[model samples]
Every structure is written in structure tokens, then in C-alpha cells.
Target: NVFQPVDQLPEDLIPSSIQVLKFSGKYLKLEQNKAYFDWPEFKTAIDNYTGEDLSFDKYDQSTINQREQEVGSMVDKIAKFLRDAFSAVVDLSKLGAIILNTFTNLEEESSSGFLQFSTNNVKKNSSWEYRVLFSVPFGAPSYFYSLVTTILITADIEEKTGWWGLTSSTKKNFAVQIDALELVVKKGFKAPN
Candidate 1:
């Protein structure tokens, strides 16, 4: 009954922690020192991404290509092992692998996040396998910070289907990582400034 007339939002859209006080009718405030991160910044990065000059579409035939495109037979199922490649952004943003069009194992399917980057001529060698650890935290109240970032996907042409099995290369071994993060909540109604 305290947060009456609350504005309902989808579960995946919330971005802050809101504290509602019972004093002076109904009061609400953006919790201080809480764990919060950038939503829009993360969203924009992968959205307007253009070129991957890395391996631009240069991949051995899927061994299962339909010429134009292959709806690839379910090569395999769930497993706890290194997986293929692709772009993915979990709760870090407004919900996107916003482009998770492939499959990932049951493990990373929940909390694990992923990303991809295209290299052109940044390094002296023209391209480099760049890995970035985004640590966003302590922007709200309570928790110190989730400190998240554990994805090392250098941009290339072929996209990994999911965070599950190997997309192809049988030699390389991928691994899971541990990271920290935080949650931000938003108030439902207006409160005194």
C-alpha cells in the first residue's frame, strides 16, 4: 500500500533502486551508493557497430551451408565446454544479446554476458584480438559494486551461435569466467526533491 499508483514496467527495463518512505504522505528517493551501471552506453556500443574487418565473412563453409544460408542442423546439444562465437550483452544493458540470435549452454544462458568488436587499423599490425573488461558498479546504495567484465571476443566474420559448444575449430578451448555486478532500481511515482 505504500507505493500505490505505481508505474509498472517490464522486468527487463528497470535501471535503478528506489526507496519509498512513509513520511509526508508518500516519499521516494534514488537510493544512494547503490550498485548501478550504464544502460544506454552499453546498448549503443553493439547497436551501431558496423565493420569487423577482422575476418569479414571469411569462414570455412559450415560443412552445412545451404548455399545462401543454412538453418544448420542442431549440430549438438547442451554441454559444459568451450563454445563458439558471436555478440552478446546480458543484463548489462536493456536486454540484448539485443542480438542473441544463436544458442548458448544452459549455464551462460542465464547470467553470462558476451560482446564482439571489429578491428580495422588501430594496431600497427592492422588488427588485433582485443579484450575488454567493463567494470561498472557502486552507483546506488548498499552493495559496493558488481564489477563485471569477462569477454574476450576479437571481431571477426563468422559469429558464434551461442555460449555452448565449439562453432567449429576443434583445437581451441574456451572457458567460463567469474565476474561482479550490481542492480539499479527505479521509483514508481514522484517524490519530494
Candidate 2:
């Protein structure tokens, strides 16, 4: 039988399982040797993020609160990774992802420490996909710099219909990725002081 309209978001959203993937980092060398100055710009990649399966009721606010904490823990890991990457280079600017052009000074809150990004969320099949982009402004001695980290999140959801036609969902196979880590720096000429 063909599936039609069976792909709608449930009235209540829930997650059953979650997973975090390995992360990668890279620094673009615009000037090659002219930059870096032998300061190993490349950093060691971070390990994969792991989480266990979860079970909870969609209508329960307490369950949602727990899930929020789970998300927060993941964010904390990302923050630590960011700190390591930034500290390796010269003292970088504030460790937050700030929208380049915005009126209200919007900032993406990663955690109590670092890392934030503009995120895009969409429903695909039984999964909620999120595309997150972080823009960080950094500076070098002889050039202007910018860093962009792109992350992908997949939260698998299982929908169910209970008594009274109440619809709920379970999340599983939830995954997060950060395979795109770009450091773009441009050379600048000195101006007369």
C-alpha cells in the first residue's frame, strides 16, 4: 500500500535514542608558510559522541525537561571541543557564534562557555534534520580571519496513535555531525600609522 499523509508531524514529539558522531577541524592556510609560523594550525580531531536509548511519554513535561538536559550535555561537549581548537591558535576572539549581519545582536547559545550557530530544522520521513552553521570572527597578526563550522543533526522519531486518537512520537538513531570545519584568512597590507 502506498503511504500518503502518514508523514505528518505528530501532535506530540518525542525521542527514543540519540547518537553523536565524530568531529573534525581544519585551518585554511591562505599564505601557506607566510602564515601559521610553525604553530600547528591543524588540531587533533575529537572523538565520537555516544548516548543511550531513551523512553518517555510525550505529554510529560518532566520527560521533556530531562531531554533538555540531555541536549545540554551534548552542547557542553561541543563547547569543550571549541575551547581546545581555539586555544591552540592565537588568543581568539569571544568564543561564540555571532550572526554576521543582524539588527538585534543575535547570538547562538551553545552553553555556559562557547560555540553557537544558526540552525535550520526540518522534518524528513521519521527524522528531524537540523543544519547548523557557526560563524566566528578571529584575527591574526598579518591577516583578517573568520571561522565557520557546519554541523548536521538527525533525530529519528517514531510516531504512535494511542487511545482517543492521541498521537505521540519516539526518537531514535539521533545523530550529530561536524565534518565541515573551515578557517578562512586573508592577507592584508599594512596601513601608514
Candidate 3:
């Protein structure tokens, strides 16, 4: 069982302790850094964004064309604000395409109602492992759900880290959590379709 809940994860592997952001359509807040933003404001940030969408070249699906570097370069003010939230714990520059996409969505509010970060790589019979998990609850709009699902398709390949994978839950909200565990563990695990 490589996938485990936050409670089950080791205290050390957990990155810096953070106050979970309680998200609902009515209000969105993260108290740790004394920062918060509302939905309309967040939505406007992404809607108005004119930066690269980070899509791959149409001819070659496998080719990224160095667009990974363009991942979180959202020109919008609030978008960059959200990037600073996660960048505080992880290096956005070091993240790969898939995770970079996830990071971008985190900034743009495409999904992710919950967020967590992990420190020293979880020792899973491999080197260079890291874990960052996020969740989108039912409260999030359907549009973001579809958007996230599209992003999930990208999880098919090894991300910026060596490897990554997701675990799901069959709970009330039907929400899914992505460990995006920087597994970099085994060499040939299939990416989710």
C-alpha cells in the first residue's frame, strides 16, 4: 500500500505544518500565511491569463518543447500570489510537466480544494522521492473537475520528478486525492489513462 492517508504518513515526511484551507463556494481561505482569496477573484485571474497554456506540440505528444519552464508564469496578480503559497514549500522551478500543470492549476483554481506537502523523500526502495498531495471536493465547480480530469491524463508519463501516481477514495463527495507522490520508484509503472 504505497498510498496512504495524511494521518498515516510519517510526521517527518510531512513538509511544514500548515493550516488546512477550508474551501467552499461561499468562501476560500488559508490561514497559515495570513492570505486568502475569493472564487470570483480567483476565476478572473485564470480567465484573464494570457500566458502560455503549457500544452505540448500538436504533432508530437511526447515532446514538451521546454514549455515546462513556462508552467507557472501566470501574468495575473492573484495567480502569482497562489504560486507563492506552494512555492514556499516546494521549488516550482524543479517540478516537471505534469506536476507543473498541477501547480499551475493550484494557482489558477482549476481544482484542488485541499493541499499538503511532504519533505525528505519517502523511502520506498528508491531514491529522489517526494510527495505532494491535493484534493478537489464536490464543492468545487464541475468545470474545474473536467479541467482536472484532463490534467490527470497527463499523469500518464513520468513527471518532473522521476515518477508519480495517484490514489483515490470512494467517499461521499466522490472527490479524488492525488498523492502525486514523487515516487520515482519503480521504472515502469503504467501512467493512468
Candidate 4:
């Protein structure tokens, strides 16, 4: 006679056991160095904008707000491009493996590491993955600068490279649409320049 209690059940005999509980991890890892690496030129621009001798009071709040708005808009665009480009590559049945390999290789070459930010929903529905990252630089100025720079550079690259050519126009349009959304979101908000 086998009498098993729920609390004392054998691990092996358990029919619905999570042997290898797999989960998707969060994508955003704020790295000051990596953000700088991704957009060194833009970093420099922000540094110059707020020089060593310059005090916070010297900068105009209106200008900073405007800049933030611009950056936010661009970041939205970058996100859209990422989503579309990733989906396009994964959707192509014939080139799926090759595209995924190439994307991984490029990431390895560029960052020396890869971070996965995928949802099970996307994986199941579209045979693709999706990730959203929020990189915050150490200092306020540095972080803001990095954010804006990343977006602008990403959008520019997607437009020029034709890597996401199939969905490029749609992505671009989506980006622009998101930019408008950002503006509305931040319309009444004011930031110190």
C-alpha cells in the first residue's frame, strides 16, 4: 500500500515538476562604460554641452527639457527598429538560423557579451524574441546624454544599413509616431538646463 502525502511526495515521482525552471530575465543593465562605448561621440557632445567650469545654474531649464524630449523621441524610434528588425529576421523561415547566428555574432563582436531580453509570447507567436533595455549612466548628465545618443545613433544606423530593409519604413514611421507620443507625455514637464 503506497500512501503519499502532498508534502512528502518523492521528487522523481512528481508528475508536474519544474526540473529546469526556465525564465526570461530583465534586459536593462545600466553600464556607464557600455553606454559610452555605444555612443562615444554623443557622450562627448553632452560633456561639451555641460563643461567643467559651467555650473548647473548656467544651463537653461527650457533647453534641457527640449533636449530630453528630443532624446526620448529618438529612443522610442530605436526601440521600434529593434523590434521590427528582430521580427523580420526571425520570421524568415529559410534564413532564421543564419540571421540569428549573424545577429549573435555581431553582438559578440560589438559588446563582447550578449544579453537576452525575450518574452515567451513573442517566441511562441512570431518565432522571434524581444527585449527592452533602459541604460542609465552614472551621473545625471552622463545618463541623459547616453540615452539620447543611443537612440539617435541607433535610428541613424537602422536607416542607413538596410539591415531591416523589409520593415525599415514601418519602423521609421513607428518611431516618429512614438516621438510624438513622447512629446505629449513630457509636454508640461520642465527640466533644469
Candidate 5:
């Protein structure tokens, strides 16, 4: 009979923590940010449709274009934020060695040129829905901590929308989860000297 030691494990034994962090934060932030950016434009388009800002036909086209531009800009900002966040996380000299050891390896690939979300209701004074896909890797322990922080910031910003009647349980959950993840990372995963 062969016996396997608890400490001796195959690569597959290490579950992909990457998925846990990636989908939870990445997709949530992506959708939330998209809605944040598009909501104002969407409201503006709605206002135009009701108000006499222009001839009905002209207002329709103009408002739709404005909404489209806002969505485009939002996508651009999400990409930029992700780039900056990843750079900060993987920068070993700053976050220290423990974080590096925790992550051990990392990789990330994303494509934003394609529109994964849209709505035809822009012309009819309705809401637009968008879907965003993100592929991410967290090779260092610090990466998880960094991601939690970023998601917290994003959630805080989204929370402000409560004033606009766009309440989000998702944002609230993100905040709570971020706090929990931070606590676990800080205490449960400390590296030995």
C-alpha cells in the first residue's frame, strides 16, 4: 500500500483561487462601472425624449448618440483601471516578498474591443444592459489583497447612487465581502519567517 503525505500534493491539489477573486470582483466592477457611466447618459436621453430640447426625431438620434459615447468611454475607463490595478499588484518591490510568495504565479488576458452588452431601448426611453467578460490571474498573495481593495473602492462609488434611486444589493455585498477577504488575508495567510 502506498501512502501520500498530507504535505505532498499535486499541482491540481491547489484549487484555483484565481477564479474566486476574478469573477466576483472583476465582473461586478465591470457591470457596476458600466451602469455608473451609462446611467447619467441614459437619464439625459430620457429627459430629452420628454422635454422639448429638439424636434422629436432629432432628439432621438442625438440622445442615442450621446448615450453610446458615454458607454464607450465607460468601457475605456474600466480597461484603464484594470491595467493600473494589475500593475500595482504585480509590482513586487512595493508590496513585499510575502505577497509575492502567496501568489507564486500570475497571468491576465482581457479583450474589450467587442461589445458584450447593449440595448435597443435607447430610442424608446428605456434602460440598457451590458455584459462584460474579464480573464484575470493572481499569481501573488498581494494580488488578492489589492483586488479586494479595488473592489471596495468601486463599491463605495456605486453606493453613492442610492441618491438616484438605483439601489444595488450587489454593491453592498461587494463591500462586505471585501472586508471579509481583507481580514482573512491579513490574518489567516500570514507567511512564516
Candidate 6:
């Protein structure tokens, strides 16, 4: 009865929206932002990072134990880029906020940290797969610049024990997402990750 405003006529149970995914971690709303996700920089040192496998040390001597100040320094730039990344995918209206999860280890100066995501889908029913790709900087500084990329994901949806019926059609709605375009300062490299 909950889904029953059961209006006008019959058989009208179309999904209001496509499958949704739930992100875990703190999130900041899409407002006058304080920062974006250079959060990973805490764990990474801009070496020639060719793969998604980047590195980080909670306490990079370059950052000199002042992790807060270091990450905070890139707030505006990071925030802007994150904003841009989301805009690259869905309409800014559908986006509620950006995840605010951060990780590091000032002790060992390393990060086992990585951002994570999972959808609201289960073993069966209707669903879609989504992959988020964002760029991170490789090599820091007024010294040099390099290449980087982001999270790769996979999803599956299937059932129908036999030819019993057809599974709902999945979507490519927001597929091919692109985040973290070219840096603002690839030359000076003052850009945030």
C-alpha cells in the first residue's frame, strides 16, 4: 500500500529512477566548499606513478608532519576539481554532495587508504554498473609533473532461473565518467591532486 497512491488506471509501476549506488565515508555538500579529494595525496608521493597504484606516507617529510596544513593548502583547487568531476557525470542538481573520506598514517607515513564505492544492487533484480575515474597527480611541485588516473570498477546483474522472464534493462546513462582533467598548473605544478 505504501507504493499505492495507486492512481488513475493500471500496471503503472515504472521505476522513478535507475539503480542507485551508496557511497561510504564523510561527505561535504555541493556548496561553498572547503576542499576536494586531494585527500589521497596524504598517502602518495608524486613519483612516476604510471599505474593506479599510487603511494602515500601519512608523514611525508616534504609535508613535514603538518598534514592538516598540507591538505588544507589545496582546499580551493581540490574543491573546484571535485566539483568539476561530478559535473562531468550527472547533472549538478542530482548530485547531493561529494564524499569526504580521508585516510593516512602520520606514524608509518603510509596509506593503506583508497576511496571505495558500492551500489544498492544485490545478487538479483534490476541494476547498473558504474565506474568513477578521477585523476591524481604524479610527482609534486615547482619541480616537475607527470601522469595519473583513478578507480576502476566492475558490476554484474543477472537472473531468470530459466527463460522464465527478462531481466530489466541496465543503463549506460552515466557511463564513461571522467574526472580530474589536465591540471591547472602542470608546469608550475601548484595544482592539487
Top candidate by TM-score: 2
lDDT of every model, 2 decimals: 0.23, 0.25, 0.24, 0.22, 0.24, 0.23
Tens-digit lDDT string for candidate 5 (136-182): 22343332222322111111222222212222112221111111111
Each candidate's number of clashing pairs is 18, 3, 1, 2, 4, 9
For model 1, the local distance difference test gives 0.23
User: Which stretches of model 6 miss by more than 4 angstroms?
Assistant: 1-111, 122-142, 146-148, 157-176, 184-193
Deviation in angstroms for 9 in model 6? Answer: 66
| 3 versus 6: better lDDT goes to | 3
The estimated TM-scores of all candidates read: 0.21, 0.31, 0.19, 0.17, 0.23, 0.21
Candidate 3: worst-modelled 10 consecutive residues by lDDT? 142-151
> Which pairs of residues have clashing backbones in candidate 6?
26-100, 43-55, 43-56, 44-55, 44-56, 46-139, 57-109, 58-109, 58-110
CA lDDT, candidate 2, residue 101:
12
lDDT of 3: 0.24
In angstroms, how far off is 115's CA in candidate 4?
3.1
Q: Model 6 scores what on Cα lDDT?
A: 0.23
lDDT of 3 at 7: 22
Per-residue alpha-carbon lDDT of candidate 4 for residues 25-108, written as tens digits (9 for 90 to 100): 111234532322222332233345432321111111110111222332433334444334332112233333332333334334
- Candidate 2's C-alpha runs over 4 A off are 1-69, 87-141, 158-173, 187-193
When summed lDDT is taken over every stretch of 10 residues in candidate 4, the lowest stretch is 178-187
Estimate candidate 5's RMSD in Å: 21.3
lDDT of residue 158 for candidate 2: 34
Q: Which of candidates 2 and 5 is the stronger one according to lDDT?
A: 2
User: In candidate 6, what are the lDDT values of residues 1-193, reduced to their tens digit?
Assistant: 1000111111211111000001111211223322223324412323333322222221211111112222223222334444454322222322222211121111121122232233334543322111222222223421111112222212232321211222222221111121332111122111223
- Put down candidate 2 lDDT per residue, 1-193, tens digits, no spaces: 0000111112221010001111111222224222111113323211121222111111100001113223334433444454555422232222222211110121222221123222223543121112222322223432222223333333333331111121123223445543323333223211112
Instruction: Highest lDDT: give the candidate number.
Output: 2
